[PDB]
Design a binder for this molecule. Structure first.
Ligand SMILES: CCCCCCCCCCCCCCCCCC(=O)OC[C@H](COP(=O)([O-])OCC(O)COP(=O)([O-])OC[C@@H](COC(=O)CCCCCCCCCCCCCCCCC)OC(=O)CCCCCCCCCCCCCCCCC)OC(=O)CCCCCCCCCCCCCCCCC
Ligand SMILES: CCCCCCCCCCCCCCCCCC(=O)OC[C@H](COP(=O)([O-])OCC(O)COP(=O)([O-])OC[C@@H](COC(=O)CCCCCCCCCCCCCCCCC)OC(=O)CCCCCCCCCCCCCCCCC)OC(=O)CCCCCCCCCCCCCCCCC
Ligand SMILES: CCCCCCCCCCCCCCCCCC(=O)OC[C@H](COP(=O)([O-])OCC(O)COP(=O)([O-])OC[C@@H](COC(=O)CCCCCCCCCCCCCCCCC)OC(=O)CCCCCCCCCCCCCCCCC)OC(=O)CCCCCCCCCCCCCCCCC
Ligand SMILES: CCCCCCCCCCCCCCCCCC(=O)OC[C@H](COP(=O)([O-])OCC[N+](C)(C)C)OC(=O)CCCCCCCCCCCCCCCCC
Ligand SMILES: CCCCCCCCCCCCCCCCCC(=O)OC[C@H](COP(=O)(O)OCCN)OC(=O)CCCCCCCCCCCCCCCCC
Ligand SMILES: CCCCCCCCCCCCCCCCCC(=O)OC[C@H](COP(=O)(O)OCCN)OC(=O)CCCCCCCCCCCCCCCCC
Ligand SMILES: CCCCCCCCCCCCCCCCCC(=O)OC[C@H](COP(=O)(O)OCCN)OC(=O)CCCCCCCCCCCCCCCCC
Ligand SMILES: CCCCCCCCCCCCCCCCCC(=O)OC[C@H](COP(=O)(O)OCCN)OC(=O)CCCCCCCCCCCCCCCCC
Ligand SMILES: CCCCCCCCCCCCCCCCCC(=O)OC[C@H](COP(=O)(O)OCCN)OC(=O)CCCCCCCCCCCCCCCCC
Lengths: 98, 52, 55, 63, 347, 50, 120, 140, 459
């Protein structure tokens, strides 16, 4: 297929493996998650603008809004984590091993 | 479970954005309107197993 | 020797120790989110490259 | 019971159970053929309804 | 929580699952999952302790990752099919990604790694919602995409879920983790019979929801979250020991009980398709689940563990808890096997 | 009745016996149609067995 | 399996052609078993709340029996309907495809040779 | 690695010993790499040297099991001239079990792995013979 | 068969609506009425089985097992009412409910026209047995014993489920009456080999087979008296019943598949009987004797000759009566010394003469004294296995020595010798206990007058 789809999919997989291999922070995880959402926005947008399918032009906006609301939820979760340990470190979230 | 509430109650919740050959604003055709219309009118009613 | 040890050893005790040992290897997780998502990435890589489930 | 009664009751039981067994074998064969060919009423996995297609004259003619 | 806000949030959970069930567009499927997660997050953080916040964080990360893989599968479906019908998938890459996304939403192994954590961190009612109602929407999507599900993938996920959920609960003394590993094993049982006969998938889902709702309702009635706290039940409420006895003997698949019904029917639809090794290995692996069910019945019903002195005070207060549908679910989860051919109502 | 509990199990036999007779008429398709025991009906007789 | 059959008329518990079928009698043994489940639900409901199990709430036990018989009657009607639809599709398919269902030559045992295996 | 099994099973038994041994060695090495990947995943090693040591240990253990399995089964099917015979894979599976016991430095695990892996390899040969399917395609 | 299932279910209101002192007498009375009603199953024909319905029939194999099963419930109620006298009334009614429910499952296990219904009832019999053992057993090891009893049976029987569903898909039916006429010969393959094993190993465990019998000297010993009676007298015989049903479908492959298992039984009856020579636990001695006697039933079913089936079903009925009486005698001394050590209480004929005579009769029927039906079954199995191979008589005959040796040693250790000095709570024998012994032994000795009713469908 088209050559720009290669780069947008590979960007999605780069941000996937960033979101699938944490270092320390939960904020860097949410950044990788929203990079995944951004790459989905770009890819759905390039398809819908390519094929001239008119009614799906409202589709990525929806894909923005919900997922941006999703990001808000995650940020609040992070803040509750940072209201317990003082950092947003993912290694402090191990109380449920037992 | 596909509880087909839309066909039962006669409402159109999401069928309009489903295909490119549907009713578009200001009668804008997609770039593959004829091909998708031909594929849908071929594969209609005969099931997926026959349609493949 | 037979009906208090060996026929008691081969069928029930070996299988029971096997299930106990696999149960202690499965549930020996440290609760770390990093390790679970790294296992998910290894899962996706083995499912694509090693098992060809995308073909 | 009379031996007549047990005998004819056994014939009735054997007819009913032989009919059910032949119908289960036919049921297996019918399911196999309808999954293989997809031409019967079963395994009719859905396709797109062609009533959704807009057959109006669009904005550009080449379609 | 404000009870009006609780009612609106539970209706929004139910609304998101219904929007997954009744919609024909993929964006509305994704919207139903987003609405469902966004509304179930306060149900997990109801008691406001760090275990609930950690559990909600882990749940958010796994379900967000699954929703992103779901939308990527949908976008690749729009690439290779040009349309949005919730039906079969027109690319094996999109089929693989959607099967992975739904496996992450269900907690099927090796994406099971969030289910015993989160169920431990949250209350018993929210864990009831997570293990019964939150299995409905991904199994509905797996019901509708099964002409494109790869066989070896779904069977690998199924046997791996059954084996890992079997070996999980043998080491467990916490009841919510026991129900979580039971969830992983039963979801493996549901998806194994999926491509052969999805009516038996629906039967297994309904019987599992009935039995799990019975066990969580007994756990909420007795206010027990550990095995050793459940062992105090005979000195307080002796009928509840009989109820957890018959329900845990049902959940192991022991005839003549109703929980024998799904797995038998699963075998009944897998030996038709000339698979003999796979339902045999699955049935033998279910003995692990039955073993830790028997462990719980030994601790609760069939012996009498020592209680304490303060239990004598609780003899003077009857249960003021709304044990909703507990006789109905207890009867349905045990005495339903003579009504086995009722399963044709799910066809 | 002063001793109403001693008729649970005997009547449960009698009723059960009744159901067995009630099932026999549902398995009466080959009554007087077996190749061994078919015969002309005796006068004032409608069935060979009941 | 039959999801394309009940897709032209979706979300019908009992369709119109279900009325062509005989309904179950009120003395159905399956319906009596579901009424027994209602009685067991009533007894368990009195047992869990420390009530006299046979005595307390005869109105409640009677509503248990009534509600389970009421739900189970329609469940049995739909059950009989779906098995009749299964058999109708089977018989229509065998009638429409004679080449897939040939009439077998039934040979008597005077021609049929089976290998004998002596048990000794 | 579906084609690893295909380049194992396409060669008849007791005909080409080195390539069957190499194919079973590669199957065992791939299984060891998968177990090593999940093992360094779920249980973090203390260093990169410990991680590559665990990877090499599990990989060489599983590959030696596969190598001695394929070697023993092929040599048994040559000296018996019975390729369509699961006793060859019974002997090879007990050889792989004793290999596992030698790598784990224990006799009881060696005998248990002999018994269970021999019965498993016998069942696999019988499944290749009579056509037993574990991931059976839906037909009815 | 619905004239028996409904009274057995009406035994549940008969025990839960009874007055608190009448819940043993009423259940004993009406269970004896059901056992008198059980004789109508003796309407057996030389050609056709007594075929009731699509769900139930009863040939001459299932009929004596049914009569023994319906007879065993009043005897279990008489046996188990003394040591459960201090029990709570609700748990007492629950124990009676578990016994009634186990009888209910057994009577439609032996009359199952169709084999998957046979499987459902056959594995339904686990749960009341498991609850009785793991709830009203006396010692600590009842829990572990219930685990072994549950997980040998389920691990043997879950392949039986897949095998029976495979027969339902292949042959079209699992009706036994249909499969009498639609049986195909099973050829030689590995697929048919594991078909044979999946159809047989569940019943091998339930008989029990030697090497797989490890559940039984724990399950029979750690049970209460009613549990031990129903486990020895009926629940072992489900395996012989099921093998005699299922070897219809396993020919001619059984003719070369039975060779290891016959060895496991022909050696097993030499081993377990020898184990009975060194058992300090008397109840374990009776348990290993039960293994030793059921080894002959396994051999006789696997050689599948008519004399072997006649002797095997006669041995099943006879061993049910004899082993049930031996467990009841061991209970009659356990309720006086509160221990199961056999060397502890000695010289009991000096103190209890009539109970020593009941021990004498149970030991003589244990050692197959003619003309008991013990000897009729033992002798006919020995005849058929001499026809099978002429060397087996050695393994038979030496067994008939060792079977005598522990049958009288049990009589000499407990009843004879010098009485134990310090044990002074040896009460005189109750009328209940002698009633229990007589209701075991008098039907067993009356069946020597007319043994043709316990010789199976091919008399
Ligand atoms: C069809 C689908 C039905 C789905 C279930 C709907 C009800 C349950 C869900 C909601 C709920 O919890 O309601 C409370 C629930 C009672 O459950 P609970 O909390 O355990 O209460 C226990 C006792 O009731 C505690 O007693 P109480 O003193 O608090 O109140 C006495 C109460 C008084 O009741 C009332 O006052 C209700 C009447 C007024 C209702 C509103 C009118 C306006 O009596 C009862 O409710 C008796 C129990 C009735 C049976 C409950 C189960 C119904 C059937 C469920 C499905 C069964 C399927 C079997 C299939 C088997 C084979 C597969 O139901 C009711 O109160 C109403 C029952 C109405 C049954 C109608 C059935 C036919 C419908 C058409
Ligand atoms: C009938 C069966 C279902 C009954 C459920 C409720 C039973 C109950 O509450 O009994 C207590 C009550 C007597 O007690 P209570 O003085 O009222 O109060 C309780 C005590 O204070 C009790 O004192 P406590 O609680 O302080 O301490 C003692 C303790 C003693 O407990 C312990 O020590 C702990 C456990 C001991 C070991 C475990 C033993 C086994 C228990 C489980 C059963 C397993 C086997 C079941 C099948 C195998 C699969 C698991 O607990 C109990 O005894 C609790 C009371 C309940 C005992 C019976 C439980 C029955 C429910 C489970 C079985 C039925 C459902 C599942 C069926 C599965 C498939 C068949 O018993 C009865 O009333 C029995 C029923 C008598 C009349 C029956 C009439 C039938 C008429 C039928 C025709 C009319 C309807 C027509 C409908 C159709 C129209 C079309
Ligand atoms: C499978 C083969 C065995 C692999 C697991 C071995 C156990 C774990 C271990 O290594 O523990 C040591 C070690 C720590 O354990 P430990 O400290 O020794 O604890 C044990 C005690 O110390 C006790 O001291 P010990 O170590 O000296 O004794 C251990 C005992 C050794 O037993 C003895 O020394 C006495 C018994 C003699 C050997 C067993 C004979 C049984 C015969 C079969 C039954 C009768 C069949 C009759 C047939 C007749 C007709 C042909 O072995 C076992 O308990 C293992 C039994 C077999 C395990 C698998 C059972 C599956 C049953 C499924 C249902 C059927 O664990 C590890 O290092 C874990 C990782 C080990 C490496 C990975 C596992 C190897 C995987 C190879 C491929 C597997 C293919 C699967 C095919 C079969 C299943 C479908
Ligand atoms: C109590 C403990 C011991 C229990 C022992 C139980 C029996 C031992 C053997 C069981 C084998 C598994 C069930 C086989 C069912 C066969 C049904 C059938 O149609 O077979 C033919 C089918 C043949 O397939 P088919 O019939 O579709 O083929 C068509 C016909 N041909 C061959 C011509 C093409 O066999 C199989 O598919 C596989 C049979 C072997 C299965 C091996 C896996 C299980 C391994 C053994 C497990 C034993 C119990 C484990 C637990 C032990 C205790 C923890
Ligand atoms: C195999 C699948 C992935 C293929 C690409 C791999 C890229 C190279 C990274 C390999 C792993 C390196 C590493 O040490 O990762 C661990 C690190 C988190 O560990 P941390 O505790 O932060 O650091 C101490 C090291 N244990 O983890 C990370 O920092 C991982 C960050 C991943 C970001 C991926 C970037 C794009 C990679 C190419 C495309 C895919
Ligand atoms: C209690 C149950 C109450 C049910 C009330 C009626 C609901 C109804 O009308 O359901 C319709 C549905 C059949 O509709 P159908 O289009 O075939 O559904 C496809 C499913 N994949 O009907 C069914 O699915 C019937 C079975 C529902 C059983 C629910 C409880 C178990
Ligand atoms: C053969 C070579 C394998 C090389 C990759 C695995 C080596 C390994 O486990 O390295 C350790 C590393 C954790 O990094 P570590 O150094 O422990 O972090 C503390 C900060 N000094 O562990 C990791 O970074 C784990 C993820 C590495 C990739 C795992 C899967 C590929 C390797 C195994 C299969 C081949
Ligand atoms: C206890 C557990 C018992 C397990 C018993 C398994 C029995 C074997 C089942 C798999 C098997 O070998 O099937 C035979 C099949 C070859 O037959 P065929 O259908 O011709 O395959 C060619 C397909 N293009 O072979 C194949 O399909 C490929 C070979 C499969 C080998 C399975 C084991 C490989 C090693 C472990 C992974
Ligand atoms: C421990 C507790 C007490 C014991 C309980 C019972 C345990 C044992 C249960 C199983 C015993 C073995 C099965 C019965 C053997 C009967 C005859 C047989 O099959 O011999 C083995 C076979 C002989 O070769 P052959 O008969 O030619 O095989 C081709 C078949 N068409 O031999 C061979 O082909 C060589 C060996 C191949 C592998 C056999 C493994 C599968 C069978 C066992 C499972």
């Amino acid at each position: 297929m088209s050559l720009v789809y290669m780069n947008i999919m590979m960007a999605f997989t780069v941000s996937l493996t960033g979101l699938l291999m944490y270092r320390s922070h939960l904020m860097s995880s949410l950044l990788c998650l929203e990079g995944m959402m951004l790459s989905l926005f770009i890819l759905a947008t390039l398809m819908i603008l390519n094929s001239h399918f008119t009614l799906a032009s409202m589709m990525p906006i929806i894909l923005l809004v919900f997922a941006a609301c999703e990001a808000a939820l995650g940020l609040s979760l992070l803040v509750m984590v940072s209201n317990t340990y003082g950092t947003d470190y993912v290694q402090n979230l191990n109380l449920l091993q037992c | 479970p596909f509880f087909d509430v839309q066909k039962k109650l006669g409402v159109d919740l999401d069928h309009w954005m489903t295909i490119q050959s549907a009713e578009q604003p200001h009668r804008i055709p997609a770039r593959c309107h004829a091909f998708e219309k031909e594929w849908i009118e071929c594969a209609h009613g005969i099931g997926s197993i026959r349609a493949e | 020797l037979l009906d208090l040890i060996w026929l008691e050893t081969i069928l029930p005790k070996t299988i029971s120790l096997a299930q106990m040992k696999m149960s202690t290897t499965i549930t020996s997780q440290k609760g770390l989110i990093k390790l679970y998502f790294l296992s998910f990435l290894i899962t996706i890589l083995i499912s694509t490259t090693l098992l060809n489930f995308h073909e | 019971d009379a031996p007549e009664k047990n005998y004819e009751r056994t014939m009735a039981i054997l007819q009913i159970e032989s009919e059910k067994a032949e119908l289960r074998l036919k049921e297996l064969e019918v399911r196999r053929l309808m999954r293989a060919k997809g031409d019967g009423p079963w395994f009719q996995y859905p396709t797109i309804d062609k009533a959704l297609i807009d057959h109006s004259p669009k904005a550009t003619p080449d379609n | 929580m404000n009870p009006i806000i609780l009612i609106i949030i539970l209706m929004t959970v139910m609304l998101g699952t219904i929007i997954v069930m009744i919609s024909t567009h993929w964006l509305l499927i994704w919207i139903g999952f987003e609405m469902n997660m966004l509304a179930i997050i306060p149900i997990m953080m109801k008691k406001h302790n760090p275990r609930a916040t950690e559990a909600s964080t882990k749940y958010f990360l796994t379900q967000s990752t699954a929703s992103m893989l779901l939308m990527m599968a949908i976008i690749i479906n729009l690439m290779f099919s040009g349309q949005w019908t919730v039906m079969k998938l027109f690319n094996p890459m999109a089929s693989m990604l959607m099967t992975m996304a739904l496996a992450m939403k269900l907690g099927m192994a090796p994406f099971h790694f969030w289910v015993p954590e989160v169920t431990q961190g949250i209350p018993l009612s929210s864990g009831l919602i997570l293990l019964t109602w939150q299995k409905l929407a991904p199994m509905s999507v797996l019901y509708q995409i099964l002409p494109s599900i790869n066989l070896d993938l779904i069977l690998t996920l199924s046997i791996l879920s059954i084996t890992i959920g079997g070996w999980g609960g043998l080491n467990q003394t916490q009841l919510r983790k026991i129900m979580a590993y039971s969830s992983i094993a039963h979801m493996g049982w549901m998806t194994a019979v999926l491509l052969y006969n999805p009516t038996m998938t629906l039967l297994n889902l309904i019987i599992y929801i009935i039995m799990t709702s019975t066990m969580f309702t007994l756990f909420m009635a007795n206010s027990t979250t550990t095995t050793l706290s459940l062992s105090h039940t005979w000195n307080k409420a002796p009928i509840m020991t009989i109820l957890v006895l018959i329900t845990l003997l049902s959940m192991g698949g022991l005839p003549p009980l109703s929980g024998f019904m799904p797995k038998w029917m699963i075998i009944q639809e897998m030996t038709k398709n000339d698979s003999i090794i796979l339902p045999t290995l699955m049935a033998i692996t279910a003995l692990l689940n039955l073993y830790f069910y028997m462990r719980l019945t030994y601790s609760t019903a069939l012996t009498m563990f020592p209680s304490t002195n303060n239990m004598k005070m609780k003899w003077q207060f009857p249960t003021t808890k709304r044990m909703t549908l507990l006789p109905t679910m207890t009867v349905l989860s045990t005495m339903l096997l003579p009504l086995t051919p009722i399963l044709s109502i799910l066809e | 009745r002063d001793h109403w509990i001693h008729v649970l199990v005997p009547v449960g036999f009698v009723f059960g016996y009744y159901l067995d007779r009630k099932n026999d008429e549902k398995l009466a398709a080959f009554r007087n149609k077996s190749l061994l025991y078919k015969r002309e009906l005796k006068p004032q007789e409608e069935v060979t067995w009941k | 399996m039959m999801t394309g059959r009940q897709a032209r008329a979706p979300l019908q518990f009992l369709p119109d052609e279900a009325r062509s079928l005989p309904p179950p009698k009120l003395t159905d043994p399956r319906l009596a078993y579901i009424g027994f489940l209602g009685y067991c639900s009533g007894l368990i409901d009195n047992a869990i709340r420390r009530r006299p199990v046979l005595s307390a709430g005869l109105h409640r036990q009677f509503l248990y029996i009534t509600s389970f018989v009421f739900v189970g009657y329609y469940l049995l009607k739909r059950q009989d309907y779906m098995y009749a639809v299964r058999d109708h599709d089977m018989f229509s398919y065998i009638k429409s495809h004679p080449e897939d269902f040939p009439e077998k030559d039934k040979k008597t045992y005077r021609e049929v040779f089976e290998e004998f295996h002596p048990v000794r | 690695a579906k084609t690893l099994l295909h380049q194992y099973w396409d060669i008849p038994e007791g005909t080409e010993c080195h390539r069957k041994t190499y194919a079973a060695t590669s199957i065992g090495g791939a299984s060891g790499l998968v177990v090593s990947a999940y093992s360094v995943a779920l249980k973090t090693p203390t260093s990169f040297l410990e991680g590559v040591a665990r990877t090499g240990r599990y990989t060489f253990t599983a590959a030696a099991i596969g190598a001695i399995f394929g070697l023993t089964s092929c040599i048994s099917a040559q000296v018996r001239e019975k390729p369509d015979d699961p006793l060859n894979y019974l002997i090879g599976g007990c050889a792989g079990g004793l290999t596992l016991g030698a790598r784990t430095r224990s006799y009881g695990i060696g005998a248990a792995a002999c018994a269970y892996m021999g019965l498993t390899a016998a069942l696999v040969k019988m499944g290749q013979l009579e056509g037993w399917k574990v991931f059976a395609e839906p037909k009815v | 068969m619905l004239k028996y299932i409904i009274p057995t279910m009406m035994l549940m209101p008969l025990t839960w609506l009874s007055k608190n002192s009448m819940i043993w007498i009423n259940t004993t009375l009406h269970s004896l009425l059901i056992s008198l009603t059980s004789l109508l199953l003796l309407n057996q024909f030389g050609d056709n089985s007594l075929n009731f319905s699509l769900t139930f029939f009863s040939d001459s194999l299932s009929t004596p097992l049914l009569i023994l099963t319906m007879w065993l419930l009043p005897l279990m109620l008489m046996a188990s009412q003394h040591h459960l006298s201090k029990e709570n009334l609700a748990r007492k009614k629950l124990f009676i409910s578990m016994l009634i429910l186990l009888q209910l499952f057994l009577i439609m296990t032996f009359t199952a026209t169709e084999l998957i219904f046979f499987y459902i009832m056959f594995e339904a019999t686990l749960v009341p047995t498991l609850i009785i053992i793991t709830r009203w057993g006396n010692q600590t090891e009842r829990l572990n014993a219930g685990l072994y009893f549950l997980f040998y049976t389920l691990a043997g029987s879950l392949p039986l489920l897949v095998a029976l569903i495979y027969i339902q898909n292949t042959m079209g039916s699992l009706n036994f009456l249909i499969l009498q006429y639609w049986v195909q010969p099973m050829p030689n393959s590995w697929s048919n080999t594991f078909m044979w094993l999946a159809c047989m190993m569940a019943f091998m465990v339930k008989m029990p087979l030697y090497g797989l019998h490890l559940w039984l000297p724990k399950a029979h010993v750690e049970a209460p008296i009613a549990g031990s009676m129903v486990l020895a007298a009926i629940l072992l015989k489900l395996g012989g019943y099921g093998m005699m049903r299922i070897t219809l479908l396993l020919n001619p492959i059984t003719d070369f598949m039975a060779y290891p298992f016959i060895m496991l039984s022909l050696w097993g009856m030499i081993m377990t009987s020898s184990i009975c020579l060194r058992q300090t636990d008397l109840k374990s001695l009776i348990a290993y004797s039960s293994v030793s006697h059921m080894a002959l039933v396994i051999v006789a079913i696997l050689i599948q000759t008519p004399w072997s089936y006649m002797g095997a079903t006669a041995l099943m009925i006879a061993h049910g009566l004899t082993s049930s009486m031996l467990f009841c005698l061991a209970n009659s001394n356990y309720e006086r010394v509160h221990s199961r050590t056999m060397i502890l209480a000695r010289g009991l004929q000096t103190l209890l003469p009539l109970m020593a005579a009941w021990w004498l009769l149970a030991s003589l029927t244990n050692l197959a004294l003619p003309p008991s039906i013990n000897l009729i079954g033992e002798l006919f199995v020995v005849m058929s296995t001499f026809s099978w191979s002429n060397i087996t008589i050695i393994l038979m005959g030496l067994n008939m020595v060792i079977t005598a040796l522990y049958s009288l040693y049990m009589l000499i250790t407990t009843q004879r010798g010098k009485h134990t000095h310090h044990i002074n709570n040896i009460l005189p024998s109750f009328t209940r206990e002698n009633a229990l012994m007589s209701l075991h032994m008098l039907p067993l000795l009356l069946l020597s007058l007319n043994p043709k009713i316990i010789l199976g469908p091919l008399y």
